Design a protein around this ligand. Structure first.
Ligand SMILES: CC(C)=CCC/C(C)=C/CC/C(C)=C/COP(=O)(O)OP(=O)(O)O
Ligand SMILES: CC(C)=CCC/C(C)=C/CC/C(C)=C\COP(=O)(O)OP(=O)(O)O
Ligand SMILES: CC1=CC[C@H]2C(C)(C)CCC[C@]2(C)[C@H]1COP(=O)(O)O
Ligand SMILES: CC1=CC[C@H]2C(C)(C)CCC[C@]2(C)[C@H]1COP(=O)(O)O
Ligand SMILES: [Ca+2]
Ligand SMILES: [Ca+2]
Ligand SMILES: [Cl-]
Ligand SMILES: [Cl-]
Ligand SMILES: [Cl-]
Ligand SMILES: [Cl-]
Ligand SMILES: [Cl-]
Ligand SMILES: [Cl-]
Lengths: 506, 517
């Protein structure tokens, strides 16, 4: 066909408004800017593709290019970083972005950025909030102009090829996008090349993925149907190697109900029954143990309580009227720095950032969101993130991704009261993509990032591998009794989170 | 309409049937081995039959090397509701009751005496396979061993059969399969392979005409050609193999050095499929080297030779060994240099690394490469070699190779070079075989560095075992230009300076892909 050179902003505004979904490229669209003096030679080398698909980090790609390009490793690095910093926002396109966002459009970002750079550009600029989904190559292990990434974007976002227009400066990228029935709009610094394209007619793993998802579902269903009081094993390592059956704590049952939403109704009913008949429930405060295992003077905790109450309220098993009293006791549990503490016992003073997150969640869920007493507790969690002190884990949660996950719930479900948490949190999660092997830690990152509007397909892929032949994933130690260093876990907890990660990316 | 198999009972006929076939495939368990499954331990709680552990699906993940026993047990600990420590006892008692089946192991020996083609196809977790290779002694009768843990493939998946036929170039017309599991026999029969079911007091023979006609090969031929092109282009532009230096095996932040001749020799010695023009081009660099005094080589070029840095034996051994094997030097000229090396022993009789009494030092790998030259020139029987050979042997038996050598920190490097010696002079190194081979088995897919993967792929293949796992994951780490990432093969221990090159890594990688094709 033949493009339609556009030079009138009025024409552009009318052309864009004819589409429900707009897809932006990053380079030259939204952002413009010893040996080899041209960085163009690095980006044109085949090894750069391995960097864009996340297969290797910049450090790897640099040393590999030092050899191929016959340039000192230090120089290629200094030039690459200088190129990154010099990136500037394109004011025209950023405004075209904010506009299409206030007009309630579907706006996705499809760029070929390496993970480390994308993590930097996410912290540098602020137009990221205008996107509904972010599809970066380093998090997909795909890259333009391979048709795979386009098919994945279409099926991932449920995009309709018609009413969808793609903006990019590369002809090959637009060329491929058009083969799927997407209208193209090439960005030249002077003008635009508009090419309307008829769309409507309808990835490459739905056959394999649907099978593993079914297998995993069947496994977890059987377990919880046989043990609605979620089982738990105990050891001294996060892998629960040589662990012994315990199954005398109620928190695991909560976590499952609070995280995996696709549970069949009969399991949810049966598991909910356990959360109610729990003999550790005095009033509407819960104890971690059953009475049969309660170690004598072991008090009730705000973590099991915050979850059980938050869940029951969200499922119409309690009224805010019944809960606010309990919530007020928690307000009275503040330590000398104004931080809500973990136990209903002034003689067991202990604080935990994740416990504070689940308490703060209940507060904002019941209307307590703006109580002046939560100030210190909220700042405690914010500093725990900003100071990167979450890498040392919480008192009872040693895995850093656990804190980021539960924080993402509070930040996504109450965005008005936690807007300053968004970008700092998403930066951390991006830098931690594929940084561990335990499937549960992967599922967490997969879920949290998606809720934050970023698709993490790397951890998703390597999650499918760690599934065992009976559908379930390996046991994992989610929380610990610190003084004795005792991990609690179960294959249910792991399979639950893994299944949700699969569902949230379907 | 169902086929009816000949009921064979006379062992006279059993050898009549088997004699008609060129290739025979044995299953390990219940054919060559048997064992007791039930063990009522001091628990009583839960499972009593190990048959239920092998019956569970999680066992498939163990058989395919995806998990180890400790992992598979803590999982079955939950599924079977049996304490972790009890399932471990049961498995150990089961393994300990393992015994040969004398009837079948004799069938194996006879078929090997008649110079048949015999292969072993069995599902065995990696840790158990390492154990069986040490416990029993019929492995010598196999022309090639295909174990699930070494393949990431298990029976009766048709894939594993298709891989066996492809890897071994098996002509299924004259091939028979001995197994007890009826479903493993059915799948083989659908490949044109005649079956023979092993029962108690009864063989079931079923002739299979066959004739009716792997699947990762297209991806493999492409990646092999790409790596070939990358290496030939690099070596043709720099026949003196370049090298980088840094503080880590990763060679991250590596500065160009390319003033050492060892990399050049290692590639000539290790990559067999090098194009001829490069072999000559690189060979010239070795002969016309700066630090070539007499017939003793120096690691550095004279421009980079530190003050009073002497000639070393590791370079001289390899260079001479290569020049001899390529008919570019006569044994008559090398034996005088070999005598200098025998005159280079320390208080304990171990051949030292340097031609310099002021720089005494020893290295098990350098000893290995020296002993290879000795046995290659007729010195194999010399008295003065005893202490040096034992030094290498204790290094292997004491599992001290796991801490690396003075100049080679990667253990797989020690095993690889020792496998050249053990395999190329078998009559002089029989006691090295089973220990060396079992060690390599326990290290399958134990590290991710491409070069280390190739070393295990090559060594295990020369020792008769096909390592497909490392083979697959080797194709992953291949960068988009064909070549593999850099890798630091040896070090300057005083300053902890690693040497390596993308040429080195790619060279071994291509060899490993070549040797399993
Ligand atoms: C759900 C959840 C993580 C709640 C927070 C606290 C809690 C009840 C955790 C579960 C396991 C446990 C008994 C920890 C305290 O051990 P300790 O015996 O070391 O007690 P201390 O350190 O608090 O005294
Ligand atoms: C692979 C090979 C050729 C091994 C034999 C010796 C050798 C020349 C190794 C390469 C690195 C080097 C030049 C010196 C290391 O010894 P140092 O300089 O660290 O001090 P040392 O010589 O006292 O150990
Ligand atoms: C092609 C290119 C060059 C350098 C590259 C870096 C500066 C190294 C990182 C940000 C991303 C980018 C600008 C990228 C754009 O990606 P695309 O917009 O083309 O997908
Ligand atoms: C699958 C299996 C069961 C138990 C197993 C052990 C006793 C644990 C170890 C030796 C090997 C073996 C007999 C093996 C035989 O392999 P197969 O002949 O069945 O393929
Ligand atoms: Ca671009
Ligand atoms: Ca069998
Ligand atoms: Cl009550
Ligand atoms: Cl505390
Ligand atoms: Cl804490
Ligand atoms: Cl025996
Ligand atoms: Cl030494
Ligand atoms: Cl040593």
């Amino acid at each position: 066909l033949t493009p339609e050179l556009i030079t009138s902003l009025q024409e552009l505004s009318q052309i864009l408004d004819r589409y429900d979904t707009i897809v932006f490229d990053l380079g030259d669209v939204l952002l413009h800017w010893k040996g080899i003096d041209d960085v163009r030679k690095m980006v044109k080398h085949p090894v750069w593709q391995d960097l864009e698909k996340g297969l290797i980090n910049q450090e790897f790609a640099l040393t590999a290019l030092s050899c191929e390009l016959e340039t000192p490793c230090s120089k290629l690095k200094e030039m690459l970083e200088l190129s990154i910093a010099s990136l500037q926002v394109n004011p025209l396109m950023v405004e075209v972005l904010r506009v299409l966002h206030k007009k309630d459009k579907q706006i996705y970002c499809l760029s070929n950025v390496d993970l480390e750079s994308f993590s930097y550009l996410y912290k540098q600029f602020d137009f990221w909030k205008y996107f509904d989904g972010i599809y970066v190559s380093a998090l997909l292990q795909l890259r333009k102009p391979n048709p795979d990434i386009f098919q994945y974007l279409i099926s991932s976002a449920s995009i309709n090829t018609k009413s969808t227009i793609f903006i990019d400066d590369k002809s090959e990228n637009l060329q491929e996008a058009a083969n799927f029935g997407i209208s193209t709009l090439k960005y030249n610094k002077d003008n635009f090349e508009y090419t309307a394209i008829e769309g409507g007619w309808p990835q490459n793993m739905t056959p394999e993925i649907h099978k593993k998802r079914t297998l995993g579902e069947d496994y977890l269903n059987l377990r919880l149907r046989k043990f609605p009081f979620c089982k738990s094993f105990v050891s001294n390592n996060v892998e629960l190697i040589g662990g012994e059956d315990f199954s005398k704590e109620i928190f695991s049952t909560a976590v499952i109900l609070h995280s995996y939403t696709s549970l069949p109704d009969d399991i949810i009913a049966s598991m909910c029954h356990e959360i109610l008949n729990h003999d550790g429930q005095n009033k509407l405060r819960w104890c971690f143990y059953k009475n049969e295992a309660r170690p004598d003077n072991f008090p009730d905790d705000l973590n099991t309580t915050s979850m059980v109450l938050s869940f029951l309220l969200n499922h119409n098993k309690l009224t805010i009227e019944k809960i606010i009293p309990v919530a007020e006791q928690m307000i009275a549990n503040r330590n000398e720095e104004g931080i809500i503490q973990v136990y209903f016992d002034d003689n067991r003073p202990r604080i935990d950032a994740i416990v504070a997150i689940n308490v703060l969640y209940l507060m904002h869920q019941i209307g307590y969101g703006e109580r002046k007493e939560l100030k210190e507790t909220e700042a405690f969690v914010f500093d725990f993130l900003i100071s990167k002190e979450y890498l040392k884990g919480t008192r009872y949660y040693p895995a850093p991704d656990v804190f980021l996950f539960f924080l993402s719930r509070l930040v996504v479900d109450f965005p008005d009261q936690f807007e300053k948490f968004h970008k700092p949190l998403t930066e951390m999660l991006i830098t931690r993509v594929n940084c561990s092997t335990f499937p549960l830690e992967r599922a967490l990152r997969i879920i949290a990032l998606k809720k934050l509007g970023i698709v993490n397909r790397v951890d998703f892929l390597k999650l499918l591998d760690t599934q065992l032949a009976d559908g379930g994933w390996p046991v994992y130690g989610l929380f610990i009794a610190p003084r004795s260093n005792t991990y609690f876990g179960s294959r249910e907890l792991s399979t639950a989170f893994a299944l949700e990660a699969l569902h949230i990316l379907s």
